[PDB]
Amino acid sequence: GSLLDGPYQPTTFNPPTSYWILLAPTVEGVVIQGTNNIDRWLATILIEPNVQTTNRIYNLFGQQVTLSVENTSQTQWKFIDVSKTTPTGNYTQHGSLFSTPKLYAVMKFSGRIYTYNGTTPNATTGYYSTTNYDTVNMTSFCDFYIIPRNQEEKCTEYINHGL
Numbered sequence: 826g827s828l829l830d831g832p833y834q835p836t837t838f839n840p841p842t843s844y845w846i847l848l849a850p851t852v853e854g855v856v857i858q859g860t861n862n863i864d865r866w867l868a869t870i871l872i873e874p875n876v877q878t879t880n881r882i883y884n885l886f887g888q889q890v891t892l893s894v895e896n897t898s899q900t901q902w903k904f905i906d907v908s909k910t911t912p913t914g915n916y917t918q919h920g921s922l923f924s925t926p927k928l929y930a931v932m933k934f935s936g937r938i939y940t941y942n943g944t945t946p947n948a949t950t951g952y953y954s955t956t957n958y959d960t961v962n963m964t965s966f967c968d969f970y971i972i973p974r975n976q977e978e979k980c981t982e983y984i985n986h987g988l
């Protein structure tokens with residue numbers, strides 16, 4: 826199709842700005858990570874339905890990181906964005922997406938990293954103001970597609986309803 830470039834394999838890349846990276850993860854874990862190497866170490870984790878509060882180990886930027894996570898949703902998977910602002914600091918959790926299709930998306934745009942949050946089929950976009958936003962290198966750990974920002978409405982549709 827002429828709307829969705831891909832699919833592409835898991836890879837390390839520095840995407841251009843104004844492009845949504847539509848991610849299609851399979852199992853629970855780290856979906857994607859990215860950093861400006863300065864003041865933003867950002868990642869998205871996926872959690873299966875019905876997970877009571879527990880510590881889990883995630884491989885973030887080549888080290889084991891223990892995070893306290895939960896998914897109280899009985900039916901929906903949970904994407905959590907994870908952020909630390911210093912290389913030696915702690916990750917905090919933001920912009921949860923409760924999802925049935927299990928699709929996620931990320932974009933570098935005007936000073937920010939954009940992702941989706943809320944509850945499908947009514948998910949919206951959210952953002953993280955990021956120093957040198959355009960330089961952020963990403964590693965996707967799952968298959969992904971590329972869709973232009975001018976076609977954002979269709980990306981939102983996919984987040985909410987699936988492919």
Ligand SMILES: CO[C@]1(C(=O)O)C[C@H](O)[C@@H](NC(C)=O)[C@H]([C@H](O)[C@H](O)CO)O1
Pocket residue numbers: 878879892893894895916917918919
């Ligand atoms: C500072 O707030 C947060 C965070 O890290 O962003 C919010 C998050 O909802 C919470 N997670 C749970 C399951 O309660 C978490 C842990 O309580 C804390 O990190 C202990 O490690 O604290």
Ligand SMILES: CO[C@]1(C(=O)O)C[C@H](O)[C@@H](NC(C)=O)[C@H]([C@H](O)[C@H](O)CO)O1
Pocket residue numbers: 908919920942951952953954
């Ligand atoms: C400082 O304000 C903002 C920002 O980055 O511009 C506003 C933004 O709406 C908010 N996004 C979400 C999804 O929570 C974000 C994060 O809480 C923070 O960046 C985590 O470090 O904070």
Ligand code: NA
Pocket residue numbers: 904905906919920921922940941942951
């Ligand atoms: Na999010």
